[PDB]
Design a protein around this ligand. Structure first.
Ligand SMILES: [Au+]
Length: 323
């Protein structure tokens, strides 16, 4: 294991001040330009729009264009220019640091897995929510596909078992994963019709492809809002905050390009322009950066270190999502 922040120190401890509870929704395939807040022609985030204190960041570039490339980069200390996907597994990452310093680290995954991020930590700290042995919310649709909102159930059991510790909870969304966008959301989110239902995209009508994708965003809107609502039930004992960032974007037909994962060298902008949201309880004193700060996946690591009052030399000068 190649270390990167052995000098990390936590300025204050949860037995000397209020313990901190953060949820980090790791998004999937959401495009910045299909977010109402960024100027999209459709109200794709009605529920988030109603919550005090959500900052929308209009200029975020992902590190890569695929789940395997981007997710380790989001948690890496190296930044996008030095980051090596092929050695990421055995670098210290920001969660390794936070767990070393005693932050209780949980990763629930309704997508695939942590793509190497959690491999150094005990397996009990990772849970698979794609299956019904963990996810109680699977029979809400004719595919029995387990829903992201199932990762919220029982989080109060985790909080009880870590009572009075700092806690970072990662929720890795199914989100807008394709090509079967039509499967990603329940009926109550089927707001735009008709929708595409085939695996051969391009063969679909373009408006119907857009509709299915947009419907899936509506379910992600509901998921992020319920995440914040779950956090708000602990706001008095805990300093609660919520960070959402998508791992990459998605091509939706432009110039004949669909899905994602094109190499950075010639990948279109739709594949790297990702939404990011930050909410915090005003009681925590955290100040977000300007809504239009120029931001990339490099800001995630320093954001998480700052949310837990930890400083590290390697990201000392790095812009974060918070001041
Ligand atoms: Au992805």
């Amino acid at each position: 294991t190649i270390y990167h922040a052995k000098d990390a120190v936590q300025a204050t401890k949860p037995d000397m001040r209020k313990p901190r509870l953060v949820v980090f929704v790791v998004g999937e395939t959401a495009r910045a330009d299909h977010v109402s807040f960024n100027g999209y022609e459709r109200d794709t985030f009605p529920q988030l729009a109603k919550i005090d204190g959500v900052t929308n960041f209009s200029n975020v570039t992902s590190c890569g264009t695929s789940t395997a490339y981007s997710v380790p980069c989001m948690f890496s200390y190296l930044g996008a220019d030095e980051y090596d996907v092929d050695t990421a597994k055995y670098q210290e990452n920001v969660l390794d640091t936070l767990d070393r310093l005693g932050v209780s680290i949980l990763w629930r995954d309704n997508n695939s897995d942590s793509k190497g991020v959690m491999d150094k930590l005990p397996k009990a700290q990772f849970a698979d929510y794609k299956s019904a042995t963990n996810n109680a919310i699977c029979n809400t649709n004719p595919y029995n596909e387990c829903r992201d909102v199932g990762m919220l159930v029982g989080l109060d059991d985790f909080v009880a078992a870590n009572n009075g510790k700092d806690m970072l909870i990662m929720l890795h969304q199914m989100g807008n994963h394709g090509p079967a966008y039509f499967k990603r959301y329940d009926e109550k989110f089927a707001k735009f019709t008709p929708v595409c239902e085939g695996n051969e995209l391009a063969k679909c009508e373009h408006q119907s492809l857009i509709n299915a994708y947009d419907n899936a965003l509506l379910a992600t809107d509901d998921f992020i809002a319920q995440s914040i609502q779950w956090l708000q039930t602990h706001s008095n004992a805990y300093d609660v905050s919520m960070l959402y960032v998508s791992d990459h974007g998605e091509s939706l037909g432009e110039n004949g390009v669909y899905l994602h994962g094109m190499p950075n060298a010639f990948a279109p902008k739709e594949q790297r322009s990702v939404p990011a949201f930050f909410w915090t309880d005003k009681q925590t004193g955290i100040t977000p950066m300007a809504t239009d700060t120029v931001l990339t996946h490099d800001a995630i690591t320093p954001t998480l270190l700052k949310l837990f009052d930890v400083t590290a030399d390697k990201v000392k000068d790095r812009t974060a999502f918070i001041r």
